[PDB]
Design a protein around this ligand. Structure first.
Ligand SMILES: CCNC(=O)NCc1ccccc1Sc1ccc2nnc(C(C)C)n2c1
Length: 351
């Protein structure tokens, strides 16, 4: 049956949501879009409710709405944000306009926990373990994050972590120019479009995050794309013959070769006093050639994680059908697909 919806005005927007969600309050200062913290009286959980803005304004935006809903519905992992609920006040497709997405509220992001501070090795262990556990699951569904950074990591009071914003196009709207955090975690092959990249772009990002948790400092705080590449190559060295063959962009390859060659720095000298196991894991993550980086699955089995690692509590995802990605549809066609996805949603069980 259809629950009873009630209306209210929030952020100069009308929020029509079921009665179960009480005490709606805007959160994140527009950082996560039109999101409200709410109390879900049916589960007892504190939830994050997003009212999608202009969901069907264009083919791209209609596809974006469908992609997000699809991605959120698929994810059923402790360290990955999932769908607790999805609703529309609309009684038919003819009246369908708005989509509301419901998930767990963690309350803070990785920066809102570790600002300018170098934390204990045990906290870094648990934080990186959870990122890697959730990334192993995301990658098993053949989904790439592409935007892995501390602002996309939802953390609660107990240091429990959920990954946000995986598999979306949304990050391509972000300003990537200058002295901006939105670029500091990006793998050089994605940042300078060196080749058709893979999931290993996310391992580079984990390395950037891990190093920053270890030292209390951004690993590559480049003032622009060029300055950041120079910071990167000073640490990991300039590409060798083999990687240069793999840089399919003639223009990028031609610019790389113009730079004075540098050897890879000694990671033990860069990361002074850090756990030798943490240093070892960092060397395997921050490899310039994406093909030679450690995978999330392999990194979970690393000795640095021995106190958390359990190969029977690190699950993989069910098959994720991405065939819609190559599909040419009209607004009305993406919209109807979304409506079907809203209407068919089955809630997770409540113990
Ligand atoms: C396809 C992947 N999509 C997402 O991860 N979307 C994020 C999202 C969906 C629905 C409602 C809100 C949000 S953003 C969000 C989610 C949980 C959460 N917990 N704490 C925070 C902020 C305030 C630190 N969250 C933000």
């Amino acid at each position: 049956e259809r629950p009873t919806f009630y209306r209210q005005e929030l952020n100069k927007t009308i929020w029509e949501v079921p009665e179960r969600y009480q005490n709606l309050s805007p959160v994140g200062s527009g950082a996560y879009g039109s999101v409200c913290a709410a109390f879900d009286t049916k589960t007892g959980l504190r939830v994050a409710v997003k009212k999608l803005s202009r969901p069907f304004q264009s083919i791209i935006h209609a596809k974006r709405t469908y992609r997000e809903l699809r991605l959120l519905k698929h994810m059923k992992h402790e360290n990955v944000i999932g769908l607790l609920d999805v609703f529309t006040p609309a009684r038919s497709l003819e009246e369908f306009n708005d989509v509301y997405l419901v998930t767990h509220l963690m309350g803070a992001d990785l920066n809102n926990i570790v600002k300018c501070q170098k934390l204990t090795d045990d906290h870094v262990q648990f934080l990186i373990y959870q990122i890697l556990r959730g990334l192993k699951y995301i990658h098993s569904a053949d989904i790439i994050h592409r935007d892995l950074k501390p602002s996309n990591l939802a953390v609660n009071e107990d240091c429990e972590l959920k990954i946000l914003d995986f598999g979306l196009a949304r990050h391509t709207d972000d300003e990537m120019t200058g002295y901006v955090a939105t670029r500091w975690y990006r793998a050089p092959e994605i940042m300078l479009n060196w080749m058709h990249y893979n999931q290993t772009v996310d391992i580079w990002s984990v390395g950037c995050i891990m190093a920053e948790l270890l030292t209390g400092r951004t690993l590559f705080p480049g003032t622009d794309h060029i300055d950041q590449l120079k910071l990167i190559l000073r640490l990991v060295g300039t590409p060798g013959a083999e990687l240069l063959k793999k840089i399919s962009s003639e223009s990028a390859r031609n610019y790389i070769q113009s730079l004075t060659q540098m050897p890879k720095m000694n990671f033990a000298n860069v990361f002074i006093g850090a756990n030798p196991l943490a240093v070892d894991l960092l060397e395997k993550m921050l490899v310039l050639d994406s093909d030679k980086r450690i995978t999330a699955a392999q990194a979970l089995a690393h000795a640095y994680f021995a106190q958390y690692h359990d190969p029977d509590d690190e699950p993989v995802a069910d098959p994720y059908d991405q065939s819609f990605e190559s599909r040419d549809l009209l607004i009305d066609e993406w919209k109807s697909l979304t409506y079907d996805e809203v209407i068919s949603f089955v809630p997770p069980p409540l113990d």
